[PDB]
Amino acid sequence: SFSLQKSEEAFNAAKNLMPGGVNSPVRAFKSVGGQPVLIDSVKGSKMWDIDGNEYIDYVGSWGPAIIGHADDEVLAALAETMKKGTSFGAPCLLENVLAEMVISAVPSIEMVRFVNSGTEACMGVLRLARAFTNKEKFIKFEGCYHGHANAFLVKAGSGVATLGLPDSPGVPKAATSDTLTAPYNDLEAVEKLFAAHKGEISAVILEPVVGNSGFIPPTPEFINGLRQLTKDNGVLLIFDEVMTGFRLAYGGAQEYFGITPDLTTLGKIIGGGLPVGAYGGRRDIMEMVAPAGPMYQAGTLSGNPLAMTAGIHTLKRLKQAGTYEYLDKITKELTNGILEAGKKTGHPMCGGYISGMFGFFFAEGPVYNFADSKKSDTEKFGRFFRGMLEEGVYFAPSQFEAGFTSLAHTPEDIQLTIAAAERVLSRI
Amino acid sequence: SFSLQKSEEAFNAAKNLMPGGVNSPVRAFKSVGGQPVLIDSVKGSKMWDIDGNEYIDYVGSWGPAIIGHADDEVLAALAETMKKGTSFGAPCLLENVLAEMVISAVPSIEMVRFVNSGTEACMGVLRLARAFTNKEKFIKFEGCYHGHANAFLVKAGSGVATLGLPDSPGVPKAATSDTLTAPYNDLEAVEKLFAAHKGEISAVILEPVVGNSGFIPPTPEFINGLRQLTKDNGVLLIFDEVMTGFRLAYGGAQEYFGITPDLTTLGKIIGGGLPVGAYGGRRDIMEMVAPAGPMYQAGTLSGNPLAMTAGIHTLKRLKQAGTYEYLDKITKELTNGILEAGKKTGHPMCGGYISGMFGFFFAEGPVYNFADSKKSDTEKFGRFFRGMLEEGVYFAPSQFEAGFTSLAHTPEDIQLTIAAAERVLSRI
Numbered sequence: 001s002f003s004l005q006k007s008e009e010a011f012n013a014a015k016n017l018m019p020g021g022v023n024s025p026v027r028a029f030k031s032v033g034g035q036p037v038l039i040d041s042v043k044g045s046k047m048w049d050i051d052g053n054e055y056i057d058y059v060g061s062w063g064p065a066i067i068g069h070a071d072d073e074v075l076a077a078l079a080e081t082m083k084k085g086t087s088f089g090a091p092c093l094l095e096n097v098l099a100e101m102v103i104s105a106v107p108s109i110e111m112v113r114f115v116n117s118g119t120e121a122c123m124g125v126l127r128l129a130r131a132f133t134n135k136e137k138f139i140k141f142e143g144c145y146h147g148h149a150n151a152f153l154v155k156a157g158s159g160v161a162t163l164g165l166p167d168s169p170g171v172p173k174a175a176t177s178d179t180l181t182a183p184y185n186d187l188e189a190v191e192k193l194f195a196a197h198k199g200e201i202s203a204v205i206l207e208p209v210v211g212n213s214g215f216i217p218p219t220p221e222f223i224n225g226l227r228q229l230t231k232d233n234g235v236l237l238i239f240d241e242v243m244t245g246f247r248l249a250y251g252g253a254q255e256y257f258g259i260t261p262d263l264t265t266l267g268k269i270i271g272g273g274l275p276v277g278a279y280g281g282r283r284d285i286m287e288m289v290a291p292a293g294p295m296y297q298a299g300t301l302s303g304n305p306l307a308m309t310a311g312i313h314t315l316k317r318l319k320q321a322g323t324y325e326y327l328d329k330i331t332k333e334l335t336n337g338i339l340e341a342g343k344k345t346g347h348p349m350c351g352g353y354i355s356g357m358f359g360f361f362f363a364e365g366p367v368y369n370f371a372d373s374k375k376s377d378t379e380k381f382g383r384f385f386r387g388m389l390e391e392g393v394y395f396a397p398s399q400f401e402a403g404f405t406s407l408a409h410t411p412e413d414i415q416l417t418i419a420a421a422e423r424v425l426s427r428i
Numbered sequence: 429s430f431s432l433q434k435s436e437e438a439f440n441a442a443k444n445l446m447p448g449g450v451n452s453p454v455r456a457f458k459s460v461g462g463q464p465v466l467i468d469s470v471k472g473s474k475m476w477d478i479d480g481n482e483y484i485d486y487v488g489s490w491g492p493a494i495i496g497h498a499d500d501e502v503l504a505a506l507a508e509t510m511k512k513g514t515s516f517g518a519p520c521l522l523e524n525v526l527a528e529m530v531i532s533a534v535p536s537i538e539m540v541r542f543v544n545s546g547t548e549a550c551m552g553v554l555r556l557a558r559a560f561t562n563k564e565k566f567i568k569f570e571g572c573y574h575g576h577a578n579a580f581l582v583k584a585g586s587g588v589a590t591l592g593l594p595d596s597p598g599v600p601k602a603a604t605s606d607t608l609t610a611p612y613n614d615l616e617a618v619e620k621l622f623a624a625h626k627g628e629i630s631a632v633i634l635e636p637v638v639g640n641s642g643f644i645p646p647t648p649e650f651i652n653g654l655r656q657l658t659k660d661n662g663v664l665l666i667f668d669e670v671m672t673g674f675r676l677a678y679g680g681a682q683e684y685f686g687i688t689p690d691l692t693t694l695g696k697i698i699g700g701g702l703p704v705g706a707y708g709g710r711r712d713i714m715e716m717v718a719p720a721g722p723m724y725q726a727g728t729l730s731g732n733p734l735a736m737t738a739g740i741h742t743l744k745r746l747k748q749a750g751t752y753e754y755l756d757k758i759t760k761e762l763t764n765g766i767l768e769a770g771k772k773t774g775h776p777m778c779g780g781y782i783s784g785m786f787g788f789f790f791a792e793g794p795v796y797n798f799a800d801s802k803k804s805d806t807e808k809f810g811r812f813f814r815g816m817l818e819e820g821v822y823f824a825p826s827q828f829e830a831g832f833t834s835l836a837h838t839p840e841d842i843q844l845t846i847a848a849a850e851r852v853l854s855r856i
């Protein structure tokens with residue numbers, strides 16, 4: 001009897017109010033049939049839509065909800081804090097507290113600047129790297145996402161890796177002209193870029209595990225190679241940990257892999273469900289940021305007390321013993337259970353997980369890069385995704401997004417999910 | 429005795445955690461003596477610091493607090509909404525509600541996209557204008573502020589006889605090369621740019637009343653001229669109403685002046701004290717925004733239900749009869765009271781106001797542009813600012829920021845503020 005009738009009505013109205021009916025493109029479900037699920041509420045590992053359907057959720061609002069949606073302690077903290085005002089536009093003690101917690105948690109971060117989104121964090125960190133090195137070019141990887149600042153919106157493909165051409169209309173060629181690209185997991189391509197642009201490269205930036213082209217982890221050779229190559233040449237290494245931060249380990253991907261970058265961006269989890277980003281790193285670099293130094297970046301709502309409170313209480317929960325070990329346990333079971341279901345029902349699949357982050361592809365694999373991920377059978381993914389909705393499971397509405405587990409997911413949530421997957425896979 | 433003991437200790441600690449001890453440059457008080465006031469709470473028109481000092485606040489968290497800080501109805505709405513979760517990462521009904529309200533309120537907006545800051549809104553609107561027109565250049569005015577995207581960080585004087593130059597390290601030369609500039613209130617300079625760059629200009633963007641170089645209103649000739657000139661040449665007119673929106677009138681400066689732009693950015697008031705921005709305008713233009721069209725912009729926390737709720741209830745209050753008439757009454761009295769106090773005490777001053785936005789300069793004036801504003805006696809401003817703190821009044825900690833009133837400011841507040849101003853002015 002599964003119905004999305006109320007979502008259908010409200011989304012039809014939305015399309016005449018907002019472009020494509022949404023405030024972010026993935027939300028429009030275009031690759032999975034075009035009927036988004038409008039959300040009424042979330043709690044723990046569950047989401048309820050406006051039709052009243054319940055789902056075991058593996059999106060976690062794209063990463064923030066690692067301790068569970070609408071956590072009671074976080075809500076109580078927000079309720080108390082808001083009595084004193086939600087925005088100050090001036091320093092407050094909560095900013096000191098969250099800053100101290102982040103510096104303690106994340107290996108590379110000795111000093112930190114809070115902003116309102118991952119997009120802002122990545123803008124700031126790029127400007128900072130360019131300012132510190134007095135160099136304009138940088139390297140990013142095809143398939144990585146660093147928000148929508150113009151410099152990141154660069155076209156990749158045959159014959160254009162060194163050209164910095166725009167990947168979207170409205171982005172002038174000049175804006176992307178200092179952006180170089182290489183394939184993820186291709187150290188040799190990066191070596192070639194270094195050789196052809198001696199003295200011009202400020203930084204290499206990467207998602208230390210790709211989550212925005214599906215789940216794609218780095219090979220040890222690649223990620224160590226980047227650390228060595230950058231260090232040997234006085235180039236900065238930047239980890240975009242907006243998604244991996246506080247999710248792969250308390251100290252993020254840099255702790256998980258034991259590789260320490262020069263600068264790090266954060267977001268999502270550090271806002272505890274409110275809009276917050278950050279960039280931080282080596283103190284000598286961070287001292288270039290205004291008003292300590294000449295590099296300009298500013299925000300009105302940055303460091304607001306609600307966001308700080310939510311972040312503080314989220315990190316306090318995560319810092320407790322056994323957190324990441326629990327995520328590993330349930331996510332290993334989930335990932336291997338889904339892949340085994342695919343094997344049993346005759347569908348080529350591959351995938352993997354680290355702590356609370358996972359993904360699977362309808363492809364033989366292995367998947368090492370963006371190009372590999374494009375081998376995925378997206379028609380089949382769509383059938384799987386829609387079938388799972390009907391069975392009460394909500395995965396990311398795209399083959400090209402990672403999935404997320406939370407501390408509120410139980411072993412039973414996982415078992416019910418695997419069972420549903422087996423049923424759906426047996427039918428598609 | 430006026431004591432900032434606890435603020436001094438906490439700010440010293442902050443300087444070892446965040447660059448310059450702050451999350452936005454103006455907060456460090458560098459132009460007014462360097463000892464920021466750390467905030468404990470805000471309510472109505474008042475702020476209390478961590479040392480227990482009370483102030484009548486004319487900053488309003490830089491614009492969001494137009495109905496008063498910590499409004500009971502807004503807080504009650506947040507308390508109810510948060511029970512259902514603070515972030516969904518997917519569409520919800522509250523997004524439809526705020527979108528409808530914004531479309532109704534703002535003349536130019538037929539379709540709207542929500543984002544997490546004014547910086548993001550201005551990035552998006554510029555990319556959109558460039559995409560729609562298929563042209564790369566745009567015009568910005570000296571003294572206007574549109575957030576910190578690279579294209580806007582252009583050095584004073586550049587972008588006229590030489591390509592736009594970086595105003596900050598870390599901004600590549602190429603990034604500002606498509607930015608043209610002119611003095612505010614200089615229509616002739618804009619006409620010259622149009623004639624010199626035929627087929628190359630996407631848009632003119634401006635604060636329709638400047639608030640980021642002090643308070644500087646447009647002359648009728650300038651703003652009327654811009655609307656006709658853009659129309660005549662197929663160039664988009666963009667109003668950055670992040671600060672003026674919902675403050676000069678329910679429909680912002682465009683309503684107040686009766687001049688309808690093609691695109692508008694919003695922020696601040698629209699989030700009711702939470703991080704929210706938006707860009708919107710003519711439907712045919714907005715249909716280019718992904719996923720309706722090819723122009724890329726995205727955001728994880730965009731349209732989150734907490735921020736939507738806060739905006740909805742803030743706008744609901746503003747829509748009540750008498751709002752802007754009240755703001756006009758108290759702000760006229762405030763502004764003229766301060767200017768009269770300056771005259772009586774022998775200090776050259778000039779200033780002005782519209783509705784809930786005002787400013788004064790320690791300069792003879794009149795001030796028509798950025799260059800004029802820079803004739804201000806900033807040493808005297810600092811003395812005035814610090815003296816007023818001790819009298820229990822908190823103005824913006826800069827000569828180059830506008831001031832803000834709210835529905836919670838009362839004739840009592842205004843009377844007390846003017847009396848304090850005369851006491852301080854008679855002594856500095």
Ligand SMILES: Cc1ncc(COP(=O)(O)O)c(CN)c1O
Nearest residue numbers: 117118119146147242243727728
């Ligand atoms: C790795 C990465 N970087 C940056 C961003 C941008 O963050 P936001 O959406 O908050 O702007 C995201 C969110 N998609 C992300 O996952």
Ligand SMILES: Cc1ncc(COP(=O)(O)O)c(CN)c1O
Nearest residue numbers: 299300545546547574575670671
């Ligand atoms: C006119 C204008 N435009 C854009 C911005 C940038 O907004 P945010 O600080 O939210 O990024 C500001 C700061 N209030 C502003 O005043």
